[model samples]
Target: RDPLIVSRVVGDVLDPFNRSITLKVTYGQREVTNGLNLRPSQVQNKPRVEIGGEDLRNFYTLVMVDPDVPSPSNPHLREYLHWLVTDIPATTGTTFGNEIVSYENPSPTAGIHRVVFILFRQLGRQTVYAPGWRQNFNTREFAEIYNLGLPVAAVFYNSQRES
Candidate 1:
């Protein structure tokens, strides 16, 4: 089964797309898996993201967002952008990219929040840019604006406010 769909990552934050490339995301020593539960303290720093593809000449973009911002029951500010990196070369990690928007640690105050990481194959280097604001980010529209096509890969994890 598609875990993204089960967790509503597909319908809520992104459209359905086949996973064409491999995306590995790790926060410190903890690697992210679909529906994995991670504490807010565990993701205080930016994750180590690795992209898998055939050539070093190719580039990719990575985006992270919180689909259940504020509260899951009433996420008025859905999809709060957490990070945006672009122009990352293939077979490399996010360190090789342009850090358009720096990573912000998740701080969910109300309920379980789904933090999604999406990877897109860029048409060329420096094709994507950062959005003006983080709230209500539209992943699909961003992709269309930059002609990114469908996402090459995507993964998400669950996080909630710590007492």
Candidate 2:
């Protein structure tokens, strides 16, 4: 349930001073699934992860993955790229909004795509949206893999295959 475009869950961090705090996570699944209207009423607002009271656009990146790849050869099968969103204005107490970048891959025979939503709290001093890493990246060859690191918050969820 991890991706390179996300802040890997390697360590824990706590803010000494939390501003505009509220319960971001709760336990409730309201919906009419399997054959009915499936929707929830209570949705939490995005958190503000920044140094000052400002929007940290181009601050964080989120990616989803499923380690239940059936092939085994490619453990963590990539059924679908659930999201590809980045560059959210980092506000102190704001939700990243319902931002989503869809990947058009709905293969039924591909079994159940166990989605893993990962939030990246990158380091707050990296740059994003560069020229990319395929051209004059290195000196001799032409390749670049530049990315940011300073992130603040992360959210996660998953969707199961309904058979």
Candidate 3:
């Protein structure tokens, strides 16, 4: 089965979409792999997101979310936005962008949680602000509000609380 499907990223956070752009996320030296489990303490610091594309003029938006808030089996806050950076220049990565919401380290209270990173190609330099709330954040709604259209790339990994 597709890892995203097994991890519930496809159904819970995103749907089937073509991944044309590249979004690489790394926690220190450790690269994030699909369904790869990491300790919460291992990711206490902010992870670096490297964006890739051919056009330098094209900007991108990156959103990192935890879809299994509290617990996977009972996700009252299905998508808790952990980070939001906008107006990122292609090839320049996330640091070049305006960080609307500073990165929040993952801390799962229960079962394994899926941490999803979604990249969207901006039509132009976008002026995005941080959302009012972090819990129950709708990626689709956020995308539509900014006219971001479909996602250009997406990736996710699993992390659980360290007992």
* Predicted structure with the largest lDDT when compared to the true one: 1
Q: What is the lDDT of residue 26 in candidate 2?
A: 27
Per-residue lDDT for 6-100 in model 1, tens only? Answer: 88889988888899888999988889989999998999999898999987798999999998878999989887999999988999989998999
Error of 3 at 97 (Å): 0.4
What tens-digit string does per-residue lDDT give for candidate 2 at 1-163?
A: 2322232222211112112211132224432111122112221222222222234443444443333344324433323343444443444312443344432222223333233333344445344442232211221110113233322333333233334
78-145: candidate 3 lDDT, tens digit per residue: 68999999999988788899999888889887887888999999899968877898999999888899
lDDT of 2 at 15: 15
lDDT of residue 66 for candidate 3: 90
TM-score of each: 0.96, 0.37, 0.95
Error in Å for residue 102 of model 1: 0.3
Steric clash pairs (candidate 3):
none
